[PDB]
mmCIF file of C-alpha atoms and ligand atoms in Angstrom:
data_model
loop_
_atom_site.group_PDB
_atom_site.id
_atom_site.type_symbol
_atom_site.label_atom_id
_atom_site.label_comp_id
_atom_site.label_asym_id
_atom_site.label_seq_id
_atom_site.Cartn_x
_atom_site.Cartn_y
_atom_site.Cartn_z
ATOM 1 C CA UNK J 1 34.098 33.572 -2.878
ATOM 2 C CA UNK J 2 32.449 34.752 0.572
ATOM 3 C CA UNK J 3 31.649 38.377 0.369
ATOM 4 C CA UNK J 4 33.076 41.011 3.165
ATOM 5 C CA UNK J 5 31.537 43.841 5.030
ATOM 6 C CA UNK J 6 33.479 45.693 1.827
ATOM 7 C CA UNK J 7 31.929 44.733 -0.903
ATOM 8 C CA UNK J 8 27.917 45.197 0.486
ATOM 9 C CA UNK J 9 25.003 46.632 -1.367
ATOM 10 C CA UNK J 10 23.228 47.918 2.009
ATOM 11 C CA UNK J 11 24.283 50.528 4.186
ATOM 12 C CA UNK J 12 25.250 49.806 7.360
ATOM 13 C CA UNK J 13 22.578 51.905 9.211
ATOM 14 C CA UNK J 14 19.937 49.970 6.918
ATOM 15 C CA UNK J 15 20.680 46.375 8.126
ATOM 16 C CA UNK J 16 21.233 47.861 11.788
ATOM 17 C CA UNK J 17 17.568 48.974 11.227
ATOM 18 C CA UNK J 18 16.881 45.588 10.476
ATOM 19 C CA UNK J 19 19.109 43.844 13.497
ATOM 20 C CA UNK J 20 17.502 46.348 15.836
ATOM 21 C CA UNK J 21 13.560 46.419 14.654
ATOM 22 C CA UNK J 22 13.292 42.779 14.179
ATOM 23 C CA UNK J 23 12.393 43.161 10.356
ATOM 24 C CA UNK J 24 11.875 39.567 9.283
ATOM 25 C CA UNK J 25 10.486 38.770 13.057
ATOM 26 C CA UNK J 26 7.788 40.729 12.777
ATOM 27 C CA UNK J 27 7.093 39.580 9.381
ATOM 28 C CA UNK J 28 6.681 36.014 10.955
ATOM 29 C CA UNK J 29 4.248 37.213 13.618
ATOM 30 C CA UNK J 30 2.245 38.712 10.521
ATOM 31 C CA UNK J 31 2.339 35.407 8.740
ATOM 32 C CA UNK J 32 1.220 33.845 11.670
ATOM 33 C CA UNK J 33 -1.831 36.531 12.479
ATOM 34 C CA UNK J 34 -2.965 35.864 8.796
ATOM 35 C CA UNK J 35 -4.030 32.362 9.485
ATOM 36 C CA UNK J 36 -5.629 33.673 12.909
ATOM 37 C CA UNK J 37 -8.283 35.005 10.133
ATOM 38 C CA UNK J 38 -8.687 31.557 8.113
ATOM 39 C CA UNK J 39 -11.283 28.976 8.373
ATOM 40 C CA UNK J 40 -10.263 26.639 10.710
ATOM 41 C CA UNK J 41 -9.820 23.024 9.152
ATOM 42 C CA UNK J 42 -11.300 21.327 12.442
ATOM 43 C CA UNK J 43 -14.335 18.611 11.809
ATOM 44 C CA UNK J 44 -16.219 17.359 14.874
ATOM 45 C CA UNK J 45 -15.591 13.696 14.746
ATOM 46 C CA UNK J 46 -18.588 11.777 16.674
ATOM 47 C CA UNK J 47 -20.925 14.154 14.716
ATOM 48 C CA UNK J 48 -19.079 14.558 11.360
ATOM 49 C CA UNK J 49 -16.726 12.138 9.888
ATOM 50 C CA UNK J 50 -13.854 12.167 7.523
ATOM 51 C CA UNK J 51 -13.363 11.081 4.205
ATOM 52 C CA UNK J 52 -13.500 7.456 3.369
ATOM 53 C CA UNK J 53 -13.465 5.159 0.062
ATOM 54 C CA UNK J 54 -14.766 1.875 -1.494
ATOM 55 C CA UNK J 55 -10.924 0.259 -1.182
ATOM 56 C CA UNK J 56 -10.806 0.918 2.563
ATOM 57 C CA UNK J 57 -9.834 -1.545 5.006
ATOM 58 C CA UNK O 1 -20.864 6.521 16.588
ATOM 59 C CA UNK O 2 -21.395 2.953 16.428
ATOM 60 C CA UNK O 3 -24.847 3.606 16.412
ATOM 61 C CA UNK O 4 -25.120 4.952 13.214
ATOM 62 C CA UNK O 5 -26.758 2.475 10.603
ATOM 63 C CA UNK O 6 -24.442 1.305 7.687
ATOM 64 C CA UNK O 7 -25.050 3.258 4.520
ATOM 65 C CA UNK O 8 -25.012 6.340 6.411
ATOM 66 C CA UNK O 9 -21.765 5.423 7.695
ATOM 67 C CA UNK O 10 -20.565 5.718 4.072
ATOM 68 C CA UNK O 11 -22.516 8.745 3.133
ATOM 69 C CA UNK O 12 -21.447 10.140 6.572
ATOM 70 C CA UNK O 13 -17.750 9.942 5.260
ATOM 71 C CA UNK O 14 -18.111 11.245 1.719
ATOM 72 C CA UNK O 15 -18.566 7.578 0.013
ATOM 73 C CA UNK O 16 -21.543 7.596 -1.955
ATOM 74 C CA UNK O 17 -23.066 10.366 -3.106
ATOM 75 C CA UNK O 18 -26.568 9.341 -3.001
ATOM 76 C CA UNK O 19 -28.026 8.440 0.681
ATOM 77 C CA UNK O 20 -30.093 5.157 1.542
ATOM 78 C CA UNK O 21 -32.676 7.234 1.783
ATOM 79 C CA UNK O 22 -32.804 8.144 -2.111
ATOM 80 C CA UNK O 23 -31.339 4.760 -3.431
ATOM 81 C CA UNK O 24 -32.462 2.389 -6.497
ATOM 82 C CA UNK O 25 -34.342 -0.476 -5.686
ATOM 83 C CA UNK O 26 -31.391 -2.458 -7.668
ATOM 84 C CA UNK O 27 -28.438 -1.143 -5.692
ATOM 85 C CA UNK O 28 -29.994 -2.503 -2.369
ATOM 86 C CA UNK O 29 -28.826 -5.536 -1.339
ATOM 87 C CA UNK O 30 -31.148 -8.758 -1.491
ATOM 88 C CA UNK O 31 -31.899 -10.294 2.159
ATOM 89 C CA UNK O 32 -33.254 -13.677 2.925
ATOM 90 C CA UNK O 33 -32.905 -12.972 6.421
ATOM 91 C CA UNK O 34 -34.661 -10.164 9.147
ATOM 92 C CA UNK O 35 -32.222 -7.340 9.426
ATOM 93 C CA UNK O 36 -30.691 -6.605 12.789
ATOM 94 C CA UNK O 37 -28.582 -3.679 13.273
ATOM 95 C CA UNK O 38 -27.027 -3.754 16.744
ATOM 96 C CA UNK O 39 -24.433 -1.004 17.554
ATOM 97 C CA UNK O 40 -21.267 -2.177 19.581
ATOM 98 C CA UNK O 41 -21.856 -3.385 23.208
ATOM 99 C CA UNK O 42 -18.700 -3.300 25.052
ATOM 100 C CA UNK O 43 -18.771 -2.377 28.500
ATOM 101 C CA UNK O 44 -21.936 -3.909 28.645
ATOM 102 C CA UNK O 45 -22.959 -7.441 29.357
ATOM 103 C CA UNK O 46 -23.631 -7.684 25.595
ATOM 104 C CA UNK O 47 -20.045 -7.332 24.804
ATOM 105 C CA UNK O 48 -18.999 -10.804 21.931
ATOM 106 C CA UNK O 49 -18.021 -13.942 24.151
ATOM 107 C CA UNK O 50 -15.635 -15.252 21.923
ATOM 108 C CA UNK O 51 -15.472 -19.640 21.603
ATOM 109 C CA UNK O 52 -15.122 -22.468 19.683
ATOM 110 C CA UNK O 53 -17.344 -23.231 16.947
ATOM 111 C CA UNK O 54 -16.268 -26.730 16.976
ATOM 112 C CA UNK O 55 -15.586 -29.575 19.314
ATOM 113 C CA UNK O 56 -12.400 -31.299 20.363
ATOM 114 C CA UNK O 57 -10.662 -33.431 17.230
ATOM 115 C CA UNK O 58 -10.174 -36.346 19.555
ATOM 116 C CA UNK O 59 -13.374 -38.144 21.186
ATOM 117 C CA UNK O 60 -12.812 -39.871 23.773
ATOM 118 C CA UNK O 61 -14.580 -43.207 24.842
ATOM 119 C CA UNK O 62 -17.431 -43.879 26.790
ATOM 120 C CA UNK O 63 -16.665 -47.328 28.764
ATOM 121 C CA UNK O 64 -18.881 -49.897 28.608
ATOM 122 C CA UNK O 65 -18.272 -53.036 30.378
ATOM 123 C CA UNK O 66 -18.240 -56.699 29.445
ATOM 124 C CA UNK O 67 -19.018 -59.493 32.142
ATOM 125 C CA UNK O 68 -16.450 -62.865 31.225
ATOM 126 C CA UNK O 69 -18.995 -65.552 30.496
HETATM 127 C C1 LIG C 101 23.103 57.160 16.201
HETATM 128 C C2 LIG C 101 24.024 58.107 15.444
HETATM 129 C C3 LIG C 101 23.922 57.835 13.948
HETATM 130 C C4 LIG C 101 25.179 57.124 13.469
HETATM 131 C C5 LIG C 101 25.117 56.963 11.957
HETATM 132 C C6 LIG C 101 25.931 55.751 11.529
HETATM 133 O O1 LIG C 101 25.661 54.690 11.977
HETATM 134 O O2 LIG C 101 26.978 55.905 10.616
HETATM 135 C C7 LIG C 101 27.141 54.848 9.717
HETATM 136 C C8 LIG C 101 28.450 55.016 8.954
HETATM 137 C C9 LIG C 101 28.587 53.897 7.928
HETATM 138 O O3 LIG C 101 27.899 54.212 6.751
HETATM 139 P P1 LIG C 101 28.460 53.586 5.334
HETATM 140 O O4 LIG C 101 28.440 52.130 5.324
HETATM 141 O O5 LIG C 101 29.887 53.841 5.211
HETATM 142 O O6 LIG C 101 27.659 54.211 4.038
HETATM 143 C C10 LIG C 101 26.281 54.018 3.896
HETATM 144 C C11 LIG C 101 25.721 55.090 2.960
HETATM 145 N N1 LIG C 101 24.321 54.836 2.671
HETATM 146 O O7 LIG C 101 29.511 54.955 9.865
HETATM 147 C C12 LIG C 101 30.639 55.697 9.500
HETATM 148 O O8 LIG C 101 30.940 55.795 8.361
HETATM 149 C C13 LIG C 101 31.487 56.379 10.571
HETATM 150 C C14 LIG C 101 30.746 57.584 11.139
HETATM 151 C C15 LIG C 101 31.183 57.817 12.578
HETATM 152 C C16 LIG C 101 30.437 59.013 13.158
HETATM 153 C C1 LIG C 102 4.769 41.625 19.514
HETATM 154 C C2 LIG C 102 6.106 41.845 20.206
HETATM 155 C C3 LIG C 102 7.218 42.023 19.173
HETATM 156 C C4 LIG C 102 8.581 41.638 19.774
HETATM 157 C C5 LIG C 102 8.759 40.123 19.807
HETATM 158 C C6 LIG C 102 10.244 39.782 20.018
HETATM 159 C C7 LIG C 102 10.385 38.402 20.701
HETATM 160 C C8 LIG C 102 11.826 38.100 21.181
HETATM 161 C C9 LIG C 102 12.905 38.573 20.163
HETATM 162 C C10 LIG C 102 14.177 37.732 20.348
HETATM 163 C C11 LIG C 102 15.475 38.511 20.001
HETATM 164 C C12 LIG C 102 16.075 38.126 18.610
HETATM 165 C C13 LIG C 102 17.445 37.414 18.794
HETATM 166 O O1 LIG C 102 17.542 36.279 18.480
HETATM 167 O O2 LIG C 102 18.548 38.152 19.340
HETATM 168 C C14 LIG C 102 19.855 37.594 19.280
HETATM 169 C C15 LIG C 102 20.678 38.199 18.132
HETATM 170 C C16 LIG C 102 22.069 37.560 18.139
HETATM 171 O O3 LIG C 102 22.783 37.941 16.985
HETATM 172 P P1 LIG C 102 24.301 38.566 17.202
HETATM 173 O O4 LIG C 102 25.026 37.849 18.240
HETATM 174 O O5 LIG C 102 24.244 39.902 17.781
HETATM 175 O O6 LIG C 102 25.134 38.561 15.778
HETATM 176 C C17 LIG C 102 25.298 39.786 15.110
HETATM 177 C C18 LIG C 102 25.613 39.523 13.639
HETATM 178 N N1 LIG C 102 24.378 39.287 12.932
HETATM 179 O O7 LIG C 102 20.850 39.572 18.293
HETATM 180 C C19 LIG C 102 19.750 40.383 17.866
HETATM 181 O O8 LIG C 102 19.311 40.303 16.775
HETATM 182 C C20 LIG C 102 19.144 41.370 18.881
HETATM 183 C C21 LIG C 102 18.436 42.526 18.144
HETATM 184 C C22 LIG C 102 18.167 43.690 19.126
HETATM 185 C C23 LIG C 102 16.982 43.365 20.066
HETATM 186 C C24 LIG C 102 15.857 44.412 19.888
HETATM 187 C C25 LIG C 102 16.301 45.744 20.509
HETATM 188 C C26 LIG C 102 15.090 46.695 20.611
HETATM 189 C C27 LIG C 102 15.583 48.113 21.017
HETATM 190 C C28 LIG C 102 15.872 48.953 19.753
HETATM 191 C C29 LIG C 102 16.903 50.032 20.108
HETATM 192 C C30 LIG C 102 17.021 51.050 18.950
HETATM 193 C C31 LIG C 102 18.141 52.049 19.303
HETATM 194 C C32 LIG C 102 19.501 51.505 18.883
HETATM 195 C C33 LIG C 102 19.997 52.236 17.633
HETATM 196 C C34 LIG C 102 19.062 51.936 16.441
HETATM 197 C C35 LIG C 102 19.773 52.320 15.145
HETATM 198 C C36 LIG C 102 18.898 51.938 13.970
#
């Protein structure tokens, strides 16, 4: 069955923390900061190429 | 990039392993003829001229003539 606002395992000052902070929003921008730290997976085509086989056409 | 040899190509591209350079003797391929690398030329005047490599099916004749003796 759908649950009501009855029936809730979180206070209602607790999610209104979350609806006002921008909880899961900021935990985004941190995701996306983490690859800001990563090795970029760029290769500089005329002077390095990419991978090729035998069965290539 | 055109200008890079074949071989190298491969190598530069994570074919083979082992570069031209270093080789057997019995992997290299046997040539009767002079090698010629030429990169690709278009834009150039040495850009391909594409044509037929044979002649037309139908030959025509070349008249002759007869005098009525
Ligand atoms: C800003 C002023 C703070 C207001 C605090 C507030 O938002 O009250 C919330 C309260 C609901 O709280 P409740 O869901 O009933 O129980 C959770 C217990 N952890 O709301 C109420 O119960 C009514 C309180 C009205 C004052
Ligand atoms: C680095 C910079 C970090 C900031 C980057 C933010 C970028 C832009 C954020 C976009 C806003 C998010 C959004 O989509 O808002 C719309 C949303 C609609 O949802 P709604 O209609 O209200 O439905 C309610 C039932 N869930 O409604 C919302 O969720 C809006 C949430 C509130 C907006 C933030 C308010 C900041 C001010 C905080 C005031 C705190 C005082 C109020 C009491 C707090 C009590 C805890």
């Amino acid at each position: 069955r759908p649950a009501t606002w009855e029936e809730s395992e979180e206070g209602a000052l607790s999610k209104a923390t979350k609806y006002f902070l921008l909880a899961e929003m900021f935990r985004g921008l941190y995701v996306v900061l983490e690859q800001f730290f990563r090795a970029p997976y760029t290769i500089y085509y005329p002077f390095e190429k990419g991978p090729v086989s035998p069965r290539f056409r | 990039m055109s200008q890079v040899e074949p071989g190298w190509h491969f190598w530069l591209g994570y074919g083979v392993d082992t570069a031209p350079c270093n080789t057997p003797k019995e992997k290299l391929p046997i040539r009767a003829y002079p090698y010629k690398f030429q990169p690709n030329y278009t834009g150039t005047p040495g850009a391909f001229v594409t044509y037929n490599t044979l002649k037309p099916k139908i030959s025509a004749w070349e008249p002759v003539t007869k005098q009525r003796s």
